Amino acid sequence: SAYQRGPDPSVSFLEADRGQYSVRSSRVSSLVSGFGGGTIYYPTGTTGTMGAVVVIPGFVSAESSIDWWGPKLASYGFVVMTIDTNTGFDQPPSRARQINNALDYLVSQNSRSSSPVRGMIDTNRLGVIGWSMGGGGTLRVASEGRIKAAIPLAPWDTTSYYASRSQAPTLIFACESDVIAPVLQHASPFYNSLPSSIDKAFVEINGGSHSCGNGGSIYNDVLSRFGVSWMKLHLDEDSRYKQFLCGPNHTSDSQISDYRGNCPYL
Ligand SMILES: [Cl-]
Ligand SMILES: [Cl-]
Ligand code: NA
């Protein structure tokens, strides 16, 4: 692929705290229109353009909740912006609008001569990661046709309508023990509703409470192996990452209580 970055991968490469690039960050003021500000993480030392990803939290949570994803994913070769919403009380439709405004914001930074990410962003290769109500927001955006990869984390929403209309390869992380967005009412029906025409996966984390997809605790191995691979394969067309997503006996992993998907990915 024209978009491939980094060494030929292994589980060890994915399990490491960082990928091949050093990372820097830049704050985006909450005064910005369209969302509550955030932090842009980006790799240093690179040339050319790369995929860009927005990461969004859930109800009454801040960007810190999901910020493990920022440096982790950036270090493999992505521009990754973790955001706050306008208020913690925003619901999924509002969160979808703010994901779109944050994506537009990154797109705009690519051509701003003062931006630290000027010229780094392939504005046709965009992804989204979102927790809980932000994961409902993620599925809403996935149904709109712009983004090329979606990772809902312990999603919450009031309908499966948008999941049934997803236009982007979608990996849902579920948390087995979730009592806030119970899997039987949210992540499972949303996955089950996804169309047959997209690459898709459901990874339910064994014993996980509702925060199990956020990163930064005891679940980084599964989150890394599936999550980085998902963005590599779907944003970079990097078929070197298929080996992690299709082949292995996922349910047999101690960290996975349930797996579903439509491998092989073609
Ligand atoms: Cl929520
Ligand atoms: Cl919980
Ligand atoms: Na298992």
Numbering used by the authors: 40 to 305
What did the original publication write about this model?
In this study, we have identified the protein PE-H, a novel polyester hydrolase from the marine bacterium P. aestusnigri which hydrolyses different polyethylene terephthalate substrates with mono(2-hydroxyethyl) terephthalate (MHET) as the major hydrolysis product. The PE-H protein shows a canonical α/β-fold consisting of a central twisted β-sheet composed of 9 β-strands flanked by 7 α-helices on both sides, as already reported for homologous structures, i.e., cutinases and PETases. The highly conserved residues S171, D217 and H249 build the catalytic triad which is located closely below the surface with the S171 position known as the “nucleophilic elbow”. Two disulfide bonds are present in PE-H connecting C214-C251 and C285-C302 as is common for type II PET degrading enzymes.
The structure of variant PE-H Y250S was solved at 1.35 Å resolution; here, only the N-terminus (aa 1–39) is missing. The crystal structure of PE-H Y250S contained a PEG molecule bound to the protein surface. As the result, a single amino acid substitution (Y250S) was identified which led to a significant increase in enzymatic activity of PE-H toward different substrates, including PETb. Interestingly the comparison of both structures showed that the substitution Y250S replacing the aromatic residue tyrosine located next to the active site histidine by the small residue serine significantly improved the enzymatic activity toward different substrates. The loop arrangement narrowing the active site cleft in the wild type enzyme is stabilized by a polar contact between the hydroxyl group of Y250 and the backbone amine of E102. This structural rearrangement further leads to an increased active site cavity volume from 153 Å3 for WT PE-H to 362 Å3 for variant Y250S as determined with the program MOLE2.5. In WT PE-H, residues of the loop connecting β3-α2 (F98, V99, S100) together with D129 and I219 are arranged in a way that access to the active site is limited, whereas PE-H variant Y250S shows a much deeper cleft. In the variant Y250S, the catalytic site has twice the volume than in wild type PE-H. As a result, the predicted binding pose of MHET is located in the catalytic site, whereas BHET still binds to the same groove as in PE-H. MHET is stabilized by hydrophobic interactions to F98, V99, M172, and I219, and the ester carbonyl carbon is placed at an optimal distance to be attacked by S171. We furthermore succeeded to significantly increase the enzymatic activity of PE-H toward different substrates by introducing a single amino acid substitution, namely Y250S. This substitution resulted in a rearrangement of the active site conformation, favored by prevention of a polar contact of Y250 located next to the catalytic active histidine, and a loop region of the active site cleft.
